[PDB]
Amino acid sequence: NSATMFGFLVLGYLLYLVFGAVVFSSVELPYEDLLRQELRKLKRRFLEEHECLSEQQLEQFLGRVLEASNYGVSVLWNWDFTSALFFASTVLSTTGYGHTVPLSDGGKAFCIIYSVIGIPFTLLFLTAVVQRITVHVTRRPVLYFSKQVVAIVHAVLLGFVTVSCFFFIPAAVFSVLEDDWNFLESFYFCFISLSTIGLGDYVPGEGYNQKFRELYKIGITCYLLLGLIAMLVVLETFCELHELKKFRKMFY
Amino acid sequence: NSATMFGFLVLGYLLYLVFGAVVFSSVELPYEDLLRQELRKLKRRFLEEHECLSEQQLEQFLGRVLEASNYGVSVLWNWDFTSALFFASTVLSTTGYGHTVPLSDGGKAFCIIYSVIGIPFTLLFLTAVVQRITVHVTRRPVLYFSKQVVAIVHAVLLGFVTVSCFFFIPAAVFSVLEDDWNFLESFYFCFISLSTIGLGDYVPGEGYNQKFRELYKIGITCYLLLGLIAMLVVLETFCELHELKKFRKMFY
Ligand SMILES: CCCCCCCCCCC
Ligand SMILES: CCCCCCCCCCC
Ligand SMILES: [K+]
Ligand SMILES: [K+]
Ligand SMILES: [K+]
Ligand SMILES: [K+]
Ligand SMILES: [K+]
Numbered sequence: 001n002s003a004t005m006f007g008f009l010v011l012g013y014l015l016y017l018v019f020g021a022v023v024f025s026s027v028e029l030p031y032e033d034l035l036r037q038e039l040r041k042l043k044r045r046f047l048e049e050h051e052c053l054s055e056q057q058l059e060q061f062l063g064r065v066l067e068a069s070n071y072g073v074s075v076l077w078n079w080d081f082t083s084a085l086f087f088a089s090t091v092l093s094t095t096g097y098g099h100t101v102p103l104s105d106g107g108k109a110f111c112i113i114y115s116v117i118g119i120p121f122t123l124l125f126l127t128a129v130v131q132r133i134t135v136h137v138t139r140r141p142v143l144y145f146s147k148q149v150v151a152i153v154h155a156v157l158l159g160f161v162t163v164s165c166f167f168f169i170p171a172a173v174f175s176v177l178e179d180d181w182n183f184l185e186s187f188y189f190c191f192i193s194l195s196t197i198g199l200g201d202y203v204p205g206e207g208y209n210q211k212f213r214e215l216y217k218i219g220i221t222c223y224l225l226l227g228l229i230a231m232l233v234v235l236e237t238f239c240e241l242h243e244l245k246k247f248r249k250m251f252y
Numbered sequence: 253n254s255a256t257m258f259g260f261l262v263l264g265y266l267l268y269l270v271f272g273a274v275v276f277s278s279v280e281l282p283y284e285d286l287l288r289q290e291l292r293k294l295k296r297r298f299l300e301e302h303e304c305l306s307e308q309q310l311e312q313f314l315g316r317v318l319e320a321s322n323y324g325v326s327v328l329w330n331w332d333f334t335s336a337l338f339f340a341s342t343v344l345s346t347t348g349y350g351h352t353v354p355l356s357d358g359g360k361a362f363c364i365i366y367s368v369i370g371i372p373f374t375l376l377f378l379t380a381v382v383q384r385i386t387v388h389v390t391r392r393p394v395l396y397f398s399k400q401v402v403a404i405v406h407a408v409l410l411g412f413v414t415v416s417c418f419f420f421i422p423a424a425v426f427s428v429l430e431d432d433w434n435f436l437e438s439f440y441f442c443f444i445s446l447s448t449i450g451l452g453d454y455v456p457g458e459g460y461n462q463k464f465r466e467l468y469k470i471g472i473t474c475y476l477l478l479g480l481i482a483m484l485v486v487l488e489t490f491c492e493l494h495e496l497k498k499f500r501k502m503f504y
Contacts, residue, residue: 199353251258
């Protein structure tokens with residue numbers, strides 16, 4: 001019966017993500033179309049309006065252009081559902097790249113509530129997904145039980161596995177998928193993504209003329225999601241070695 | 253003797269923050285001065301160079317302007333130490349606004365290592381700071397011991413305390429300090445900050461002509477740091493109520 005509990009948690013979470021991905025999609029998308037216009041309109045009017053404008057005339061155009069940039073809309077789509085799903089997930093995993101921020105007040109507010117509920121929901125979700133994976137991946141230090149040393153080797157080995165399997169493999173996959181991204185950049189991106197730092201200087205699936213982008217988003221959303229679980233799995237496996245519980249306990 | 257262990261942890265952490273705040277300050281600052289120039293130079297040359305330039309001539313200037321924006325440098329200082337300290341802390345608390353991202357490869361790489369070491373160090377730091385605060389703030393459900401109900405009331409009461417004390421009070425303080433920020437925006441900022449989501453659409457201490465800014469940074473760095481501890485404190489207090497351990501346990 002415990003299997004249908006975790007099985008439902010996993011289901012409901014995914015839905016909560018689609019739910020939000022939809023609510024965000026709709027409320028925030030409209031303000032974008034209208035903002036896309038105010039920019040395309042202010043773009044045309046600037047060039048055609050005052051060809052040789054002065055220092056005071058440029059700071060006024062650039063201002064309105066940069067302001068649009070900070071909100072995810074560049075003068076040169078953010079809230080579809082494939083991308084709004086991307087946002088909803090990175091907001092509950094708490095990465096927050098920012099390449100897409102809510103624009104209205106409803107979005108901003110819905111985001112807040114959606115999170116108060118989702119963030120926690122997300123912990124529970126992860127806790128379960130990890131407790132389980134942790135055991136199946138760390139039930140083997142026993143098939144080996146000397147005892148303490150089977151773990152210190154299981155850990156360091158498991159680290160070198162996922163570090164490669166989740167950073168280097170995708171660090172390369174992105175060096176591929178994303179043009180302007182070299183390896184370091186792709187790798188660097190993975191680190192700040194799976195760490196949930198999310199500076200947002202780099203975000204995949206945002207290149208001029210990207211084909212099948214809809215999926216790339218859904219793929220990323222999963223890369224990030226799984227990679228996080230993987231980290232936590234590796235974290236538990238490390239946080240549970242004798243020497244660590246020792247070092248930790250040393251401060252309470 | 254346990255008091256000098258946590259006391260040193262708290263010390264060393266703070267230093268690790270200053271250490272990084274310095275290393276980042278120096279390596280990344282230079283690329284900024286040089287980038288500030290390439291922009292001030294491309295700014296002058298654009299207006300004076302081709303007053304009435306066409307559609308093809310604007311996309312080329314705006315491109316280089318927006319590209320600078322995404323990296324923290326606007327055409328219209330990011331790595332001093334008061335602000336570099338701000339970065340180092342938000343990177344280890346994992347908020348990552350992005351208003352400041354490392355520019356060189358050294359910065360990007362140092363950041364990664366600094367984090368692999370700091371993030372953990374930061375957990376330990378928090379764990380201690382919270383375990384302690386948790387007990388002194390939740391040793392009182394006992395001074396009240398019926399028993400289970402003294403906690404469900406201690407929790408809900410403590411929530412309403414810090415929610416007000418860390419969100420509303422500062423939500424207002426910012427409505428003050430930050431011009432363009434109304435209450436919702438200030439409050440909204442606090443939520444995504446203390447949640448460590450850090451979209452970065454709003455970052456305090458970044459207004460044209462901000463006086464005593466150096467401190468405002470150091471103040472924020474602390475607001476964020478403490479507010480996080482506060483959250484975790486409140487989180488533990490909630491994660492440890494019978495009904496919850498019950499609901500949680502329901503999935504392993
Ligand atoms: C919700 C907190 C997630 C923390 C992730 C920490 C990953 C650290 C990896 C360091 C090698
Ligand atoms: C390093 C993980 C920090 C998680 C902070 C969660 C705060 C949630 C507040 C919800 C009211
Ligand atoms: K973050
Ligand atoms: K960000
Ligand atoms: K972020
Ligand atoms: K940003
Ligand atoms: K985070």
